[PDB]
Ligand binder design. Structure first.
Ligand code: GDP
Ligand code: ZN
Lengths: 845, 210
C-alpha cells in the first residue's frame, strides 16, 4: 500500500514529483510546496526547535520556495544564519514521506539501451549533427522486452534488414548465438528509415517514460547525443520530449586536457552503469571499455568481430544489429549478479534523496543526518563557505624494500568512523583546546596527558565526554543497522538451508508455501510444519528465503558504503557539518594511533623475542600494519613443523592469544592517554603469509609503499587450501601490457614467493622462448595521430610482412614490457631472474 | 459511572477535579472505534488522537470504501468516537451512595464537555457573564439529570450550579490524599495500550463471506 516517490524536481516554484500511488499506479503530481527554514530567536520566544548547538530556533513558513531561497540570500548579506534544510527537494521528500519507505522495484521502470553510430573517422562526436544513428535498442524492466531500432537506409548505408531467424550466424564464429535465451523479448519493429524511426522513440518514450535510465557510457555519449541530434531536426522544444517535464539543462564538466558536455532530463534518473560499476565495484580495472569488464564479469570476450573498425556498417547488419542487443543485454547481465541498480534504490529510499544521488555521499549523508535530526525537532545548521585547505592524510610507512619470509598483517576495524566515535567529534561536541606538543611526543607517550576532563586529539582539540555528538551518534546508528540486517541475512540463510535439507524426499501432496518471516530462524513449530510440506512450496520458500538473504545483503552493504564514505564528507567543505578543526582532529589522531600501535607492537614483540631495537613491524598503510614474524618462527625453529598448516596454526594461535591482547592493552592505554570517551580502536589479525614449508620460496616481498605481494594462507580466520597471491600494485595487468606477458609476471611472482630464485630462473627461461614465437599484432604497441597511410599499419599487405615477421625484434619488445617490470620485483626481493655470472667464486678458497 | 431510576431517569452531582501544574492537565482525550459482527467485537483506540489517521486501519478502511456514501449503516458502527476522560468527585448519588465523596473517572463525550465552555466570559457581552470552573477552590458541580421518556436515550438537564469552593481543601491532609486517588490522565493518551492490524482483520473478515 504505502506509496513512494520515483523522481522529484524543482522546476520553478513547485516540486514535480512522480510516484507509484496507493493502488500501485505511476503518477505525476505537482506541488506549490511551501518550505520552512529556521532562524535563531531569544530563549524568550522559546519553542520546541533547536540547533545542534542547543540554541532555540524558530520556524519560518514560506509562501513559495523562491520566497525562501531569497530569504537565505538576504539573511547572508545581512549577516545572520538561516538554519534548516535548504535543499527543498530533500525537505519535500522528507515531509511527503514521514516514514520508513518500502519500495516495489517492480513498479519502477528501468530502461537500458545503447547507441550505434557511423562516421568516416571512427570516434563520433556528441553535440554535432551527422546523426547517422545506425541502431538503437531500448529496454524496459516491465514489459521485459528489447525494443531494437534498425535503419535500412538513409543517406549513408542501406540494405540488409535484421534477421530474427538468422541469429547472427550458426556453426561458425560470426553469430555468437546472440539471442542465447528467451526470444519472446526481442521486438524488431524498425519502420524502414530514420527520418521517422528517430522520432518514433519519442512516441515510445511517452508510452514507457523512463524512470531509471542506465546503460554503458550513456551519461556521456548516447543521451547527451541522442538529444543534440533530434534537436537540430525537430527543434529544441521538440527535443525535451525525452523529459516528462519538457524541461532540461546542460552542465559542462571540464577535465584535464579536454572536456565534454552532459545533458540532464528533468524528472529522470540517469545512472551510467559504467559509473555505477566504477563506484560500486571495488576493482578499478585499467580501461573500462566493456569489451573486458564483460569478459571479466561474465568471463567471455565475444562477438569475435572481423572487420575495419569505424567502417563495419557496410560489413553487415545480421551481425551488426545482433551486437546492438547482446550489448544492451550484457550490461543487463552484469547488474543481474552485481545488483548495482538494486543497491542504488535501497540507498535513495533510505536517505530520502533523488535516487541518482548515490553518486554523491555529501548529499546522501546530509539527507540522512537531516531526517534523523528532524524527528528530534533539532535544526540542521547552515552550510557555510570555507576555503579549500589540504590536511594531513593517512600514514604510510616507507618500507625497506626487501623480501619478507613470514608476515602477519593486522588491520584496524573501520578506523575513521571509530576514531570519530571514540573521540566523539562533532561540530557541537567541541569543548576547547590545549597546548599541543609534537605529534611524535604523544606517540611515544612523552607529552603530558592533554586533558583530565575532555576527550582529546593530537592536534589540540577537546571534546565533551558526557554528551553524545550529532555525527558520532548517526554513525553508531548506521553501524547498528548493518549489524541488524546482516543478522536477517544470516537467518534467512540458515533458514534456506533448513529448507534445502527438507527438499530430499518431500511429502507428495498438494499444499501451499507457509507465511513466515525469513529474517528469523524458523521456530520448532515451522521446522516441523515445513517437513510435511510439499516440494512445490518448499522450492517456493527457498526462493523466498533467498529473496530475503539477498535483500539482507544489499541492505547491509549500503550501510557499509555509508560508513566508509562519511569521513569522505566530514572532510569536505561542501558538507554542512564540515570543520577543519575536526577534519584534522580525526586524521592526525589516526596518525598518532597507527604509529603508536607500531611502537607498542615492536615493543611487545622485541620482549617476547628477547631482544631490543628490532623493528618487527615492516610497514603499515593507514589502518593496517604488517608484522614480520620470522623471529617468532625461529623461536620454535623452522625444522619442527609437520607441514605448512602447522606453522600457520602456530602463527594464528600466537596473535590470537598473545598479540591481539598485547595490542588492545596498547590501545586501551592510548584511549586513556587521550582521555577518550570510549575505547573503540580494535585491531585484529588479518592475513598470515609465507612460503610453503620446505620451499625455497621467498615468501613475500615489498618494493615500495602500496607496492608488494604476499603468499597468503589464511584471511580473517578462513584457511585456504591453495595459497592466495595478494598483489598490491606492481603494474601487472597494466592496460598496455599483453595478457600473455601479464600472466607471466603473475607466474614470476608466484614462483618467487613459492618455489624460489631457482624456479623463477627456469620459468623466466621458458617464457623467453614462449615469447619469441607469439602472434602478429598482440605484442604490438599501439598509438595514433589522425589516420594512417593508404589496426592502422600492419593489417598485412604481404609485401612488407615477410620482411617484418623476420625483422621485428622481441629482444627489445620484451626487455621493455616484462624485463623492466620484473627487474624491479627481483631487485627488491634480492634475486635474479637469470643466473647472474657469479663473481666472488673466482676467489676460490 | 451512571445508574438509573429503574425508570430511565437518574440524578447525581459530579465535580471534575483539576491537576495543579506541570502535571497532566485535568483533561485527557482518547479516540476509538466500536463494532461487532460475526462475534467480532472490535473496539480499539483509534490513532486519530495522533497525526496518524492512516496507520489506524479502521479510518483507512473507512475512506478506502468511503462507506459514508455506499453503506451509512456500517459507517455509523465504525466511525471514530472521542471520549473526554477526566477525573471527577461524586458529590451526591442517591442510587449508589457508596460513591459519595470517593474519587473516580468519568467517560463523557461531546455534550457535557461543551458545557465548561459556556461557563466563562465568551457567551454574551453587554451585561457580562461568569468567569471559570474546575479548580478546587472555585468551581461548579454538575447536577447530572437524565430523562428517558418516550423520547430517546439520556437527557441533558445537567448544568453545574454556582461558583463555589470545595469542602475541606485548605487542609494538608485532604490536600494530597485527594490528588492521589486521581488517575492523572496521560496514560490514556499513550503507547501503553495497543495491539496490531491482525486483530482488525480477524474481526473484519467474514462480512463479505469472502
Ligand atoms: N525539525 C526540523 N525541521 C526542519 C529542518 N529543516 C527544515 N525543516 C522544516 O520543518 C518542517 C517540519 O516541522 P515539524 O517537524 O513538522 O514540527 P513538529 O511537527 O516537529 O513540531 C518541514 O516541512 C521542513 O521543511 C530541520 O533541520 N529540523
Ligand atoms: Zn481510526
Amino acid at each position: 500500500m504505502k506509496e513512494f516517490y520515483l523522481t522529484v524536481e524543482q522546476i520553478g516554484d513547485s516540486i514535480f514529483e512522480r510516484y507509484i500511488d496507493s493502488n500501485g499506479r505511476e503518477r505525476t503530481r505537482e506541488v506549490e510546496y511551501k518550505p520552512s527554514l529556521f532562524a535563531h530567536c531569544p530563549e524568550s520566544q522559546a519553542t520546541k526547535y533547536f540547533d545542534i548547538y542547543g540554541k532555540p530556533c524558530t520556524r519560518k513558513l514560506f509562501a513559495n520556495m523562491r520566497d525562501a531561497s531569497q530569504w537565505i540570500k538576504r539573511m547572508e548579506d545581512i549577516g545572520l544564519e538561516a538554519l534548516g534544510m535548504d535543499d527543498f527537494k530533500l525537505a519535500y521528500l522528507s515531509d511527503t514521506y514521514n516514514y520508513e519507505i518500502k519500495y516495489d522495484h517492480t513498479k519502477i521502470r528501468v530502461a537500458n539501451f545503447d547507441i550505434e553510430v557511423t562516421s568516416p573517422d571512427g570516434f563520433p562526436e556528441p553535440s554535432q549533427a551527422k546523426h547517422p544513428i545506425d541502431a538503437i535498442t531500448h529496454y524496459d524492466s516491465i514489459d521485459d522486452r528489447f525494443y531494437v531500432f534498425d535503419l535500412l537506409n538513409s543517406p549513408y548505408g542501406n540494405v540488409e534488414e535484421w534477421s530474427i531467424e538468422i541469429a547472427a550466424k550458426l556453426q561458425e564464429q560470426g553469430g555468437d548465438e546472440v539471442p542465447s535465451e528467451i526470444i519472446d523479448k526481442i521486438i524488431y519493429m524498425p519502420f524502414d528509415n530514420e527520418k521517422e524511426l528517430l522520432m518514433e522513440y519519442l512516441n515510445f518514450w511517452q508510452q514507457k517514460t523512463p524512470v531509471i535510465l542506465t546503460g554503458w557510457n550513456v551519461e556521456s555519449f548516447a543521451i547527451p547525443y541522442v538529444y543534440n541530434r533530434i534537436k537540430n531536426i525537430f527543434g529544441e522544444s521538440t527535443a525535451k520530449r525525452l523529459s516528462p517535464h519538457r524541461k532540461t539543462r546542460v552542465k559542462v564538466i571540464e577535465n584535464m586536457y579536454g572536456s565534454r558536455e552532459i545533458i540532464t532530463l528533468f524528472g529522470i534518473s540517469v545512472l551510467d552503469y559504467i559509473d555505477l560499476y566504477k563506484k560500486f565495484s571495488f576493482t578499478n580495472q585499467p580501461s573500462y571499455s566493456l569489451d573486458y569488464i564483460s569478459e571479466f564479469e561474465l568471463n567471455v570476450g565475444k562477438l569475435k568481430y572481423d572487420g575495419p573498425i569505424s567502417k563495419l556498417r557496410e560489413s553487415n547488419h545480421q551481425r551488426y544489429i545482433s551486437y546492438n542487443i547482446i550489448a544492451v543485454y550484457r550490461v543487463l547481465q552484469i547488474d543481474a549478479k552485481r545488483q548495482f541498480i538494486n543497491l542504488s534504490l535501497d540507498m535513495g529510499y533510505y536517505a530520502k534523496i533523488q535516487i541518482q544521488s548515490v553518486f554523491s555521499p555529501i548529499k546522501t549523508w546530509d539527507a540522512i543526518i537531516f531526517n534523523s535530526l528532524k524527528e528530534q525537532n533539532k535544526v540542521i545548521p547552515q552550510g557555510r563557505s570555507h576555503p579549500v585547505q589540504p590536511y594531513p592524510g593517512a600514514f604510510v610507512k616507507e618500507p625497506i624494500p626487501n623480501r619478507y619470509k613470514y608476515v602477519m598483517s593486522f588491520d584496524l576495524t573501520s578506523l575513521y568512523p571509530s576514531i570519530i566515535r571514540q573521540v566523539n567529534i562533532s561540530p557541537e561536541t567541541i569543548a576547547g583546546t590545549f597546548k599541543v606538543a609534537p605529534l611524535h611526543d604523544y606517540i611515544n607517550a612523552v607529552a603530558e596527558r592533554p586533558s583530565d576532563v575532555y576527550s582529546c586529539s593530537p592536534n589540540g582539540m577537546m571534546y565533551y565526554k558526557d554528551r553524545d555528538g550529532v555525527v558520532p551518534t548517526e554513525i553508531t546508528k548506521v553501524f547498528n543497522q548493518r549489524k541488524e540486517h546482516k543478522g536477517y541475512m544470516l537467518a534467512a540463510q540458515r533458514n534456506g538451508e533448513i529448507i534445502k535439507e527438507a527438499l530430499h524426499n518431500p511429502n507428495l501432496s498438494v499444499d501451499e508455501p507457509l507465511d513466515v518471516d525469513y529474517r528469523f530462524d524458523f521456530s520448532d513449530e515451522i521446522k516441523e510444519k515445513i517437513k510435511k510440506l510439499s516440494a512445490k512450496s518448499l522450492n517456493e520458500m527457498l526462493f523466498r528465503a533467498q529473496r530475503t538473504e539477498v535483500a539482507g545483503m544489499t541492505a547491509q552493504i549500503n550501510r557499509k558504503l555509508l560508513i566508509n564514505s562519511l569521513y569522505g564528507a566530514l572532510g569536505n567543505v561542501w558538507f554542512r557539518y564540515y570543520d577543519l578543526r575536526n577534519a584534522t582532529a580525526i586524521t592526525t589522531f589516526g596518525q598518532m594511533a597507527l604509529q603508536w600501535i607500531e611502537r607498542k607492537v615492536n615493543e611487545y614483540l622485541n620482549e617476547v623475542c628477547g631482544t631490543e631495537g628490532e623493528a618487527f613491524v615492516l610497514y603499515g598503510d593507514t589502518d593496517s600494519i604488517y608484522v614480520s614474524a620470522d623471529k617468532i618462527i625461529d623461536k620454535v625453529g623452522e625444522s619442527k613443523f609437520r607441514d605448512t598448516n602447522h606453522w600457520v596454526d602456530f602463527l594464528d594461535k600466537f596473535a590470537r592469544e598473545r598479540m591481539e591482547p598485547a595490542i588492545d592493552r596498547g590501545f586501551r592505554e592510548m584511549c586513556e592517554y587521550m582521555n577518550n570517551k570510549q575505547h573503540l580502536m580494535f585491531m585484529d589479525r588479518e592475513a598470515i603469509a609465507g612460503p610453503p614449508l620446505g620451499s625455497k620460496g621467498i615468501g613475500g616481498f615489498w618494493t615500495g609503499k602500496k607496492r608488494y605481494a604476499l603468499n597468503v594462507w589464511d584471511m580473517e580466520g578462513t584457511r585456504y587450501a591453495e595459497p592466495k597471491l595478494k598483489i598490491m600494485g606492481l603494474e601487472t595487468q597494466k592496460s598496455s601490457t599483453p595478457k600473455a606477458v601479464q600472466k607471466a609476471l603473475k607466474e614470476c611472482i608466484r614462483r618467487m614467493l613459492q618455489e624460489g630464485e631457482e624456479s623463477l630462473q627456469e620459468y623466466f627461461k621458458e617464457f623467453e622462448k614462449e615469447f619469441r614465437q607469439l602472434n602478429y599484432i598482440s605484442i604490438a604497441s599501439v598509438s595514433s595521430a589522425n589516420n594512417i597511410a593508404k589496426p592502422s599499419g600492419t593489417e598485412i599487405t604481404d609485401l612488407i610482412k615477410d620482411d617484418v615477421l623476420h625483422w621485428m625484434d622481441y629482444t627489445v619488445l620484451l626487455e621493455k614490457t616484462f624485463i623492466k617490470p620484473l627487474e624491479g620485483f627481483t631487485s627488491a626481493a634480492k634475486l635474479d631472474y637469470e643466473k647472474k655470472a657469479s663473481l666472488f667464486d673466482m676467489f676460490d678458497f | 459511572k451512571l445508574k438509573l431510576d429503574a425508570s430511565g431517569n437518574g440524578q447525581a452531582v459530579i465535580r471534575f477535579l483539576p491537576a495543579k501544574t506541570d502535571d497532566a492537565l485535568p483533561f485527557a482525550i482518547l479516540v476509538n472505534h466500536g463494532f461487532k459482527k460475526n462475534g467480532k467485537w472490535y473496539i480499539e483506540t483509534c490513532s486519530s488522537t495522533h497525526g496518524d489517521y492512516d496507520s489506524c486501519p479502521v479510518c483507512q478502511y473507512i475512506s478506502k470504501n468511503d462507506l459514508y456514501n455506499t453503506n451509512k449503516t456500517e459507517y455509523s458502527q465504525l466511525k471514530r468516537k472521542t471520549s473526554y476522560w477526566a477525573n471527577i468527585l461524586v458529590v451526591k448519588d442517591p442510587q449508589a451512595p457508596d460513591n459519595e465523596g470517593k474519587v473516580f473517572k468519568y467517560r463523557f463525550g461531546k455534550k457535557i464537555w461543551d458545557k465548561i465552555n459556556a461557563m466563562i466570559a465568551v457567551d454574551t457581552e453587554m451585561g457580562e457573564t461568569p468567569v471559570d470552573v474546575t479548580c478546587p477552590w472555585e468551581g461548579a458541580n454538575f447536577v447530572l439529570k437524565v430523562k428517558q421518556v418516550s423520547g430517546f436515550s439520556n437527557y441533558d438537564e445537567s448544568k453545574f450550579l454556582n461558583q463555589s469552593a470545595i469542602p475541606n481543601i485548605d487542609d494538608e491532609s485532604f490536600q494530597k490524599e485527594l490528588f492521589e486517588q486521581m488517575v492523572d490522565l496521560s496514560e490514556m493518551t499513550s503507547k501503553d495500550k495497543f495491539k496490531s492490524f491482525e486483530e482488525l482483520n480477524t474481526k473484519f473478515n467474514q462480512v463479505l463471506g469472502t
